[PDB]
Amino acid sequence: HFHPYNTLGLATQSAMVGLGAGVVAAAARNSLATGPRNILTTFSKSGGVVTIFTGASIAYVFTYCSAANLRERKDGWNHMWAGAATGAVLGARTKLVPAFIGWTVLCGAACGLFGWTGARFNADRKASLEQSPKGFVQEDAHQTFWEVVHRRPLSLTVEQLGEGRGINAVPIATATEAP
């Protein structure tokens, strides 16, 4: 089915990557600047970039792996919880409570909308319309995604929708027949 994650291993890999991105962005901030700057103002007038990269990396991957491990499935919700943790780390830099709540909620919603579309910038090859079976079914078969039919099985309607509202396993007519 699935495979659980190594939260400590993926977290320390991301911590090293965020440390590296912080050093690169601090050097790019020195060299693209004005005023008296030296070799030691890399981490002095840094603007706190290495804290941004480090905290965002560790929080997103730790909350993503922990939420994927306690739910025992991988879907778009884990990106929502991880993006909420990222928004918590980015929103604590502005030391205000309603700001913080806004950063958490909106960053979590944006990352959940990201992770629900596949969590990929690029395309998936087998899932797109162009590389998948489309059009009508040629004979009767299990109608896969992207396919059209004329008539659907009623057993599927009872299994997917329910046995309730106006919906029945037998139409209301021949359930009421004279013999």
Ligand X SMILES: CCCCCCCCCCCCCCCCCC(=O)OC[C@H](COP(=O)(O)OCCN)OC(=O)CCCCCCCCCCCCCCCCC
Ligand Y SMILES: CCCCCCCCCCCCCCCCCC(=O)OC[C@H](COP(=O)([O-])OCC(O)COP(=O)([O-])OC[C@@H](COC(=O)CCCCCCCCCCCCCCCCC)OC(=O)CCCCCCCCCCCCCCCCC)OC(=O)CCCCCCCCCCCCCCCCC
Ligand Z SMILES: CCCCCCCCCCC(CCCCCCCCCC)(CO[C@H]1O[C@@H](CO)[C@H](O[C@@H]2O[C@@H](CO)[C@H](O)[C@@H](O)[C@@H]2O)[C@@H](O)[C@@H]1O)CO[C@H]1O[C@@H](CO)[C@H](O[C@@H]2O[C@@H](CO)[C@H](O)[C@@H](O)[C@@H]2O)[C@@H](O)[C@H]1O
Q: Which residues bind to ligand X, rule: CB under 6 A?
A: 17, 20-21, 24-25, 28-29, 32, 75-77, 80, 109, 112-113, 115-116
| Minimum CB–partner distance for residue 25 and ligand X (Å) | 4
The count of residues interacting with ligand Y (CB under 6 A) is 11
Task: State the minimum distance, in angstroms, from the CB of residue 49 to ligand X.
Answer: 7
CA proximity to 54, closest of 6, 111, 5, 93: 93
3-state secondary structure of 84: helix
The C-alpha atoms of residue 48 and residue 29 are separated, in whole angstroms, by: 11
Neighbouring residues of 72: CB distance < 8 A, sequence distance ≥ 6: 2
CB of 144 to ligand X, least distance (A): 16
Query: H or E segment at 136?
Result: strand 135-136
Q: Of 26-34, 58-66, 102-110, 164-172, which part binds ligand Y (CB under 6 A)? A: 102-110
| CA 170 remoteness from chain centre | 41
Q: Pull the structure tokens for residue 55.
A: 């905290």
Residue 139: contacted member of other proteins, ligand Y, ligand X, none (CB under 5 to 8 Å, by partner type): none
Selected binder of ligand Y within 98, 135, 162, 166 (CB under 6 A): 98
User: Which neighbouring-strand residues pair with 14?
Assistant: none
State which of residues 34, 135, 138, 163 lies at the interface with other proteins (CB under 8 A): 135
Query: What does 97 bind: other proteins, ligand X, ligand Z, none (CB cut-off 5 to 8 Å by kind)?
Result: none
Coil, strand, or helix at residue 135? strand
The one among 6, 12, 16, 146 contacting other proteins by CB under 8 A: 146
User: DSSP label at 44?
Assistant: T
Report the interface residues with other proteins, using CB under 8 A: 129-130, 134-135, 143-154, 156-157, 160-162, 165-168, 170-178
